[PDB]
Design a protein around this ligand. Structure first.
Ligand SMILES: N[C@@H]1[C@@H](O)[C@H](O)[C@@H](CO)O[C@H]1c1nc(-c2ccc3ccccc3c2)c[nH]1
Ligand SMILES: N[C@@H]1[C@@H](O)[C@H](O)[C@@H](CO)O[C@H]1c1nc(-c2ccc3ccccc3c2)c[nH]1
Ligand SMILES: N[C@@H]1[C@@H](O)[C@H](O)[C@@H](CO)O[C@H]1c1nc(-c2ccc3ccccc3c2)c[nH]1
Ligand SMILES: N[C@@H]1[C@@H](O)[C@H](O)[C@@H](CO)O[C@H]1c1nc(-c2ccc3ccccc3c2)c[nH]1
Ligand SMILES: *Cc1c(COP(=O)(O)O)cnc(C)c1O
Ligand SMILES: *Cc1c(COP(=O)(O)O)cnc(C)c1O
Lengths: 810, 810
């Protein structure tokens, strides 16, 4: 049908049809009289998976023979989403599979909808890891992703009476056709025990053992025949575990709980023993695997020439002391040599400055669970602080600030400090964030070791986030500039020569309109909700958080409602305001925000004076598969975090690529997006980081804004008096109290500029030609935000390897 | 190589080789450079499984179209063993697969050894269910086996310091290629709650729900292209289960523990809540499946014409009140009609008379777990006792004895009484056992309803227990009488015409000798133990139990040892005494018996005066796969339970078929074996049932035997004084105390006759020609003990269906 989806040759289609019927019969044990759509999805998934196998085997053989430097990307989260379509795109099979299924009387798009998201992450951090795997494979790097195979991923969100309810995400119920269990490469992981000091070093003894069983998932590159591996560990009890009899067998669950469930907190640290077990589990199994693979090529001097370990935040930080443990206690290297190897091997990416998101583990937990690791951490600390004292003699406060060990009623280990000490490179994830790291929280470390600190601005893969989710847009671009941009996104700059081309303007607007109609129909079918597809689609999708300021969006929505009610016969640009995202189950204020959004909807959506001029929809169960539907449909992207709080953002980039304009603060990567597109093509508002600092120095007083802005005062009086909760008038008093007295994120301070900026958006939307021209200028300059660019920078500036666009033989 | 293993046609072999390589590549994702023997086993298993698929689909289609009466065999245990070889035998693929693997450079026998036993049973009862499935498929019956898919089957036994240690049987670790998950046919099962009485009947409300997810395993018939289904249920929590958040997800284990582990007690009742949950789980899921399938053909009058439910002992007895619950509470039938349907549908097989093995559930457990079922049981009881009172007016003691409810400090439900009341047929499992049921424990029930009581003597499948495990014997028989005996075992009678044939005599003895050499080599390789393969192989393999009298065997072994030490230069027929079997983990005396056996071995096997004239070996981890190796190698089968205690036995039959002679009491099926072979061709000894009763009436005094038999007194003095435990002289005092003062099984009473009978065995073994002639007379008359015979009797006399030997089209 469309060119970017590849060729549908007669031979190919015939072979796909025969293999589909083979899998239906032999693999699924069904005939066509009793097969359901789910059976047809599985038969297609098996058919496509068969095409990965030869390439996967050949890729791994090639790495064994060439012995390149291996890159190990360690993460507690990989937010993969669905695999079927991505696999077809990367192998150029989409049109052939479409034709083959069409000839069998099946709609492939319907089959695709049956697949479960692999939801093994919370949001941006996990999704970044997934985009990175795609880019590493596309760039020909010998890269492995290592994590945990959680039995339950991020919970499914249901909304009942306007409140979030959580349900277990039983994503493996029907099986996962994309993983291959490798029980033969099972490895032991140790916990508890005690340390004995002998004549020949320390020995960690009397430990409890849990087995780590790997499951491997293929990661195909874009049309290069490279297939890399994501290896996820699952916890198994040994067979003599606890071995009256029945109870001992049932108690195997205590060991196997390690891999049961993903902790569901985005950008928030909860110091629970089970989480620490998860972190050590992934690190200990992974490092044995790395060392095994290295020895199958005595001399650990070459280790950093053959291995890079990238730490995705501090969550796998125990890799540093574990590597030291293995090298010193088991391989018998002297400390200094082991440390040199460790530092040259490890690199740390920081993804946040919010203090509540930083990992600080109580010493008593480490003492009980990982006694040898605590000893090694103390030794690292003493040697590190000796260097600090020599560089800054007499600066006793600096010694306190830089210590890996934090004093207090409860002593804690600061894992970020451990990662900086033990890594040759430390990076932030957008320019402003990397600058903040050097000026504020890691200033002391930067002064000691300036060379370590880098920036690597985040990116997104244009395979999933353009070609897969928005084929109409991909195609109209391809008609003008060819297909090379899909793995060289900077070529989108060529689109600036079409900004005055009437046909291109029309086609861009047509694709957006089609995406909007398709999304409006999805809403009616799956959720019984009717929306005006001529309205401006104003979208804020991301995890629910005070710092992301969904509440600021709420204040604007109420402002618009109140203006309509005041002058009902005045024209206003119609909007559909969509907000979606999950709240962490224990985050009370985030749950109250969701309830407020639905409560605003209940009033606005049923007021006959408003009509279809304003609709407020809470998008339930926001996840990767829903992002793929809503982002191509959006007109306006809301990226409105308080300046200095969003390290990067990546949703922002997804919207830019897909033909939405952005309303945003100068925060995270929004700064760089505005620089690439031109500030004139971006709706910038609000305090900059410097303005926030100036307010903090004199003291934020929310009452001042309330006293000076009548429209704001009206909204607060409506919230307080029960206008949005008539049956429970005090329902929102915690929200009001927070905004008035302890708002860390200064919602009122950006209100006036936000409302004014939103009026400029509405003014531009009235002129569809100029709106669309601005869109073209955004899409055209989005190339910097490819994760291919990001990964090439990691490769050259951190890992010391060269990317390659060359194809392996098919 | 050998004819009974089928044809190895060039086309067939070529296709097997290509499909093997296809599975190695696409299914296992290995190439031949990194493949292990386990990978090669899996590639072969997938290759063979492919041949089952078309037949499985076509068989189930055929039952849908013809709509025959369906037979549902409900059991808590199915002791299947390995599947690969059995599948090849039943599809006539063994020689082709042998050739195909040989041409790939692989030894198929080595690959077969990699497969795990499916050990989902304890012993005889579970293995009987497995033989029955094989026979039902071979006889063309529309039969389904229903049970529980335990994650952990019967424990693996290790012997450490002569003591049994248990290890979890993690049989699913590497995957099970023979099951197909059917998550689409998942059904809810209810627990706890309470009963509300409304205008329109009782309602069971406020229940906890557990999901039952079926896994289907194919059951191929012998060369008839029939493939039946074994459906095993696995427990899953619903997704809103318990839905802080993390703990709620982890607590899903409470629901899923239902299918975690097989209770490891053979012929012993333990009244634990988890076991009751297991029993209800299997029954509730199964009955919904049965009713669904019946409705897809209002009128439950035809239910018993389309459905038979066979209860494998009382373990699935809750099927009776569950069927009543569904018909009365959900379908709204009147009680009397529902009861008529239930009785005509259900039949009960009793497998034991030992009082400790009978299920008697405390009322308080049923009250809490299954409140509606308890109400229905009380109503059944009241109506049943009303019939008793009308038939036997004034017989108040009979009312007490026959009640389903037992009075006491703790009220209990007698499940056997429930099964008799609710079934149209009740059978025992050997003639003597069925007679005992009518004269003793069910006498009252027999007097009320004589027509219900039947006998169905047990059997074994000659596919697994001759063709599979002893191909050499199968072949020499086939050379004389053809291949038809494999599904018509009565044809073995034709072998009586070869009892004087010198060539046949030689060939029978040669096969035994080859089996003995092969087993002696297995022992050296896997266990570092050397045995004389010219010695008489004296074998007792079965679960360890006081009633089975491994202790009587021990007394004979010590007797032989003491006789040798007394007259060391006298000739004795050399023996290797092998004893094997698992003890239930909580059964202290059974564990002490194992320790005694190994302790006897430690003395006997290292006494240089004994030499290789006597060896005592404890066979570790006795299971179905080990039975297949040791039984073909045995000369003497020990079947020495106290008369009246072994309901049938089936090991006895396996040994008869494989060319061992039997030393045994007149107990269970031994009686019928002796009748078929002639008493002159059997080594019968000991008390008959009547002699045991006469001893019980005057009182068993073990001291009398001790005082009168010097050889027995010497053994007891050796046990007591520490001769077999020099480091711990009192180690065996519990055994001595039991034998002298509270032996329920009268070991001393059969000692003298047992020793004398063993001397007759040794005398016959000295004359190999006459030994072998007696063997031929046993093999020749073993035909009655085919499970095909047993199943044809169930079919005609209980289920009302006709067996068929006709082939479905291939
Ligand atoms: N049998 C298991 C199932 O237990 C399950 O659905 C899953 C492993 O948990 O994958 C299945 C399985 N998958 C493969 C397989 C074969 C080829 C592959 C190629 C690419 C990616 C995955 C593959 C998995 C073999 N077995
Ligand atoms: N908020 C940033 C985004 O601004 C950023 O775009 C994204 C990818 O760099 O990483 C997100 C991020 N996520 C976390 C995060 C995720 C899970 C956690 C679990 C436990 C403790 C801390 C966690 C922090 C830290 N930073
Ligand atoms: N993928 C699962 C794995 O999760 C696992 O090894 C097992 C189900 O638990 O069987 C695998 C599986 N087996 C089949 C399959 C196909 C044809 C069959 C024919 C006969 C018997 C079993 C069959 C199983 C499909 N999937
Ligand atoms: N001992 C007999 C054998 O003599 C007989 O050959 C076999 C098959 O009929 O059934 C055995 C049998 N096994 C049980 C048994 C098995 C498991 C149990 C689990 C819980 C409670 C009672 C149980 C009884 C009862 N009877
Ligand atoms: C991209 C993405 C995120 C990150 O969005 P931000 O706006 O950067 O927080 C979160 N969740 C999902 C499902 C995503 O696809
Ligand atoms: C046949 C068999 C049994 C039953 O043997 P009995 O001697 O009848 O108790 C027990 N276990 C296994 C593994 C079997 O094959």
């Amino acid at each position: 049908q469309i060119s970017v989806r590849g060729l549908a040759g007669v031979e190919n289609v015939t072979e796909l049809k025969k293999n589909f019927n083979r899998h239906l019969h032999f693999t699924l044990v069904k005939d066509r009289n009793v097969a359901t759509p789910r059976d047809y999805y599985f038969a297609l998934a098996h058919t496509v998976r068969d095409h990965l196998v030869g390439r996967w085997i050949r890729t791994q053989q090639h790495y064994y023979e060439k012995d390149p430097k291996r890159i190990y990307y360690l993460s507690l989260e990989f937010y993969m989403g669905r695999t079927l379509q991505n696999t077809m795109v990367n192998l150029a099979l989409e049109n052939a599979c479409d034709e083959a299924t069409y000839q069998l009387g099946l709609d492939m798009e319907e089959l695709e909808e049956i697949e479960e998201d692999a939801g093994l992450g919370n949001g941006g951090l996990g999704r970044l890891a997934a985009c990175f795997l795609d880019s590493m494979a596309t760039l020909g790097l010998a890269a492995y992703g290592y994590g945990i195979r959680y039995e339950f991923g991020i919970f499914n969100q249901k909304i009942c009476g306007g409140w979030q309810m959580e349900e277990a995400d039983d994503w493996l119920r029907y099986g996962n056709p994309w993983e291959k269990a490798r029980p033969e490469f099972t490895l032991p992981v140790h916990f508890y025990g005690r340390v004995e000091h002998t004549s020949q070093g320390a020995k960690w003894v009397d430990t409890q053992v849990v087995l780590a069983m790997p499951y491997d998932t293929p990661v195909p590159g874009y049309r290069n025949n490279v297939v890399n591996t994501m290896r996820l560990w699952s916890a198994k009890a040994p067979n003599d575990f606890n071995l009256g009899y029945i109870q001992a067998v049932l108690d195997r669950n205590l060991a196997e709980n390690i891999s049961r469930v993903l902790y569901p907190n985005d950008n928030f640290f909860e110091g629970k023993e089970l989480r620490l077990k998860q972190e050590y589990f992934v690190v200990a199994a992974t490092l044995q695997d790395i060392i095994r693979r290295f020895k199958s090529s005595t001399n650990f001097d070459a280790f950093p020439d053959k291995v890079a370990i990238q730490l995705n935040d501090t969550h796998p930080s125990l890799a540093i002391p574990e590597l030291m443990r293995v090298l010193v206690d088991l391989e018998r290297l002297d400390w200094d040599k082991a440390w040199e190897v460790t530092v040259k091997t490890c690199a740390y990416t920081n993804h946040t400055v919010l203090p509540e998101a930083l990992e600080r583990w109580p010493v008593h937990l480490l003492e009980t669970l990982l006694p040898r690791h605590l000893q090694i951490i103390y030794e690292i600390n003493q040697r590190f602080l000796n260097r600090v004292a020599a560089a800054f003699p007499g600066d006793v406060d600096r010694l306190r600030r830089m210590s890996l060990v934090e004093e207090g009623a409860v002593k804690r280990i600061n894992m970020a400090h451990l990662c900086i000490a033990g890594s040759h490179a430390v990076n932030g994830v957008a320019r402003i964030h990397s600058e903040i790291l050097k000026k504020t929280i890691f200033k002391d470390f930067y002064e000691l070791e300036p060379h370590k600190f880098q920036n690597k601005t985040n990116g997104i893969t244009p395979r999933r986030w353009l070609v897969l989710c928005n084929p109409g847009l991909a195609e109209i671009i391809a008609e003008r500039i060819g297909e090379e941009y899909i793995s060289d996104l900077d070529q989108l700059r060529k689109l600036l020569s079409y900004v005055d081309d009437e046909a291109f303007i029309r086609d861009v607007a047509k694709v957006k309109q089609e995406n909007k109609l398709k999304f409006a129909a999805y809403l009616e079918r799956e959720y019984k909700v009717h929306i005006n597809p001529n309205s401006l689609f104003d979208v804020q999708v991301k995890r629910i958080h005070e710092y992301k300021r969904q509440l600021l969006n709420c204040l604007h929505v109420i402002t618009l409602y109140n203006r309509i009610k005041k002058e009902p016969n005045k024209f206003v640009v119609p909007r559909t305001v969509m907000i979606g995202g999950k709240a962490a189950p224990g985050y009370h204020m985030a749950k109250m925000i969701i309830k407020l959004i639905t409560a605003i909807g209940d009033v606005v959506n049923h007021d006959p004076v408003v009509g279809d001029r304003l609709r407020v929809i809470f998008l339930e169960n926001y996840r990767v598969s829903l992002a793929e539907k809503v982002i191509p449909a959006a007109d306006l992207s809301e990226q409105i975090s308080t300046a200095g709080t969003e390290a990067s953002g990546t949703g922002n980039m997804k919207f830019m690529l897909n033909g939405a304009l952005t309303i945003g603060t100068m925060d995270g990567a929004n700064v760089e997006m505005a620089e690439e597109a031109g500030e004139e093509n971006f709706f910038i508002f609000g305090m900059r980081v410097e303005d926030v600092d100036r307010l903090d120095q004199r003291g934020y007083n929310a009452q001042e804004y309330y006293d000076r802005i009548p429209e704001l005062r009206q909204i607060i009086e409506q919230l307080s008096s029960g206008f949005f909760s008539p049956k429970q008038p005090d329902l929102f008093k915690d929200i009001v109290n927070m905004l008035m007295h302890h708002d860390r994120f200064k919602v009122f301070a950006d209100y006036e500029e936000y409302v004014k900026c939103q009026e400029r958006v509405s003014a531009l939307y009235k002129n569809p030609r100029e709106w669309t021209r601005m869109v073209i200028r955004n899409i055209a300059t989005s190339g910097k935000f490819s994760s291919d660019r990001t990964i090439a920078q990691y490769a050259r500036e951190i890992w010391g390897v060269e990317p390659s666009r060359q194809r392996l033989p098919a």
